[PDB]
Design a protein around this ligand. Structure first.
Ligand SMILES: OC[C@H]1CC[C@H](O)CC1
Ligand SMILES: OC[C@H]1CC[C@H](O)CC1
Ligand SMILES: [Mg+2]
Ligand SMILES: [Mg+2]
Lengths: 253, 253
């Protein structure tokens, strides 16, 4: 029984942990960044997956607290090893409208960047497709302010939900992440491949970088690489893993 | 002011009228079809525009009645002149998920087509961006059934709302209508033109046709024509007009 009070208690007890999935250069296979995903480790019941708590976190507003804690915990995890990270190491944080609009959001982003090195790392706010940022002047002001501070944006799960051409028109973002439904169907159906080409063409004029999500097989990767995708992410390389294991597997060694 | 009961009463009092906007071949300027739009003429106070009633029509469910009436009235309006219509004359009807999934929908579409000539006209169900059809087997069955009956589909206001690549992947539609926000901004801003190019490239592989909406100036039209758009629609040619005036201006002369 997942309730707002159970989520609040779990936040106090720091049960929401940052699992980290590596991301790679499509050209060379080299580690270029990561995405931070949340896992609720309930001390008795075990893993409660995002599907069961994120929606309620969002409607209750608790998501703001959760995201703040994940950002803070990500800084703590990576700080001891920040000198071992490649240059321009990307850190992907999933951001909903509620977090984006919350007083003090910009400050939390700066704290993460300052702790880890203003110029060593690149913070990528991965804007969700489900609870899009509204298209308003105020939203654009926050967006522009963060950009002036060298923080960057992705449209996440592009091609699904509210992740439309309109968002690219309203917000000059830096990355587009292709939803896995297109990546994984591009070798199977008649349009999914064409959709990936379309996203590649879309990115080219403004000079955005593309990441293919959900890369599961080598043929999917080769296909994505061949179509001009810049970064790759998925279970072929690694699923998301706990922080200590992310450090141990992908940073050390 | 505007309530579900006022909408119900207005339906019974026939205050919702089908206005009709012509659509044209971009290459030649020739009449190829129309879109059926709704206007609420309140007897004392005047027009209540779609923006103020459609949402409440949709959430209340009354949209199903309204759309049914509009389809029926469009048949009545065009029947006397159907022999004067060009071959393959397109009739665009705006359809939300609620209408599409309602009992009796397919039947209403057939009645329209049979009254007007199975092979003279082409019914185009313009799927809305606000209230997308769910991506389910049952939805796809209704979609396929209608296709077998030579009824066609458009993704309306493509690039906005939920009108994403995913809808093209889930439903093999026949047309894409480009939202006016791209048509009218193409050559004011830095990406809108690029977005139209992208929609043109998107359509080409599966062989879909494109209509540019909101064509307001000659330079917008020339631009859309140059980029390979197939059909044009907007105030430059004509706003929507009452049926009798549609017939008198665009059919019977
Ligand atoms: O390392 C490439 C990065 C691109 C942006 C993404 O949001 C994170 C991974
Ligand atoms: O006349 C071309 C037609 C294209 C489909 C649209 O939904 C109606 C107009
Ligand atoms: Mg993400
Ligand atoms: Mg329409």
């Amino acid at each position: 029984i997942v309730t707002p009070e159970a989520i609040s208690l779990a936040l106090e007890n720091h049960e929401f942990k940052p699992w980290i999935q590596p991301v790679f250069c499509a050209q060379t296979g080299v580690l270029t960044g990561c995405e931070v995903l949340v896992r609720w480790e309930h001390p008795q019941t075990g893993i409660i997956p995002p599907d069961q708590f994120i929606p309620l976190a969002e409607s209750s507003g608790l998501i703001v607290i959760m995201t703040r804690q994940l950002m803070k915990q990500t800084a703590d995890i990576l700080m001891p090893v920040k000198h071992l990270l490649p240059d321009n190491f990307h850190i992907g944080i999933n951001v909903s409208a509620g977090c984006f609009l919350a007083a003090g959001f910009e400050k939390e982003c700066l704290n993460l960047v300052n702790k880890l090195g203003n110029d060593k790392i690149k913070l990528v706010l991965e804007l969700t497709e489900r609870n899009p940022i509204p298209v308003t002047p105020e939203a654009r002001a926050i967006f522009d302010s963060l950009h002036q501070h060298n923080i960057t944006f992705a449209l996440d799960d592009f091609g699904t939900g509210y992740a439309t051409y309109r968002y690219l028109q309203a917000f000059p973002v830096d990355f587009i992440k292709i939803d896995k439904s297109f990546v994984q169907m591009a070798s199977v159906d008649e349009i999914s491949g064409h959709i990936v080409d379309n996203i590649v063409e879309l990115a080219r004029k403004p000079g955005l970088s593309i990441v293919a999500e959900g890369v599961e097989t080598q043929e999917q990767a080769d296909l994505m690489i061949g179509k001009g995708v810049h970064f790759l992410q998925g279970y072929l390389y690694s699923p998301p893993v706990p922080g200590n294991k992310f450090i141990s597997e992908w940073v050390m060694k």
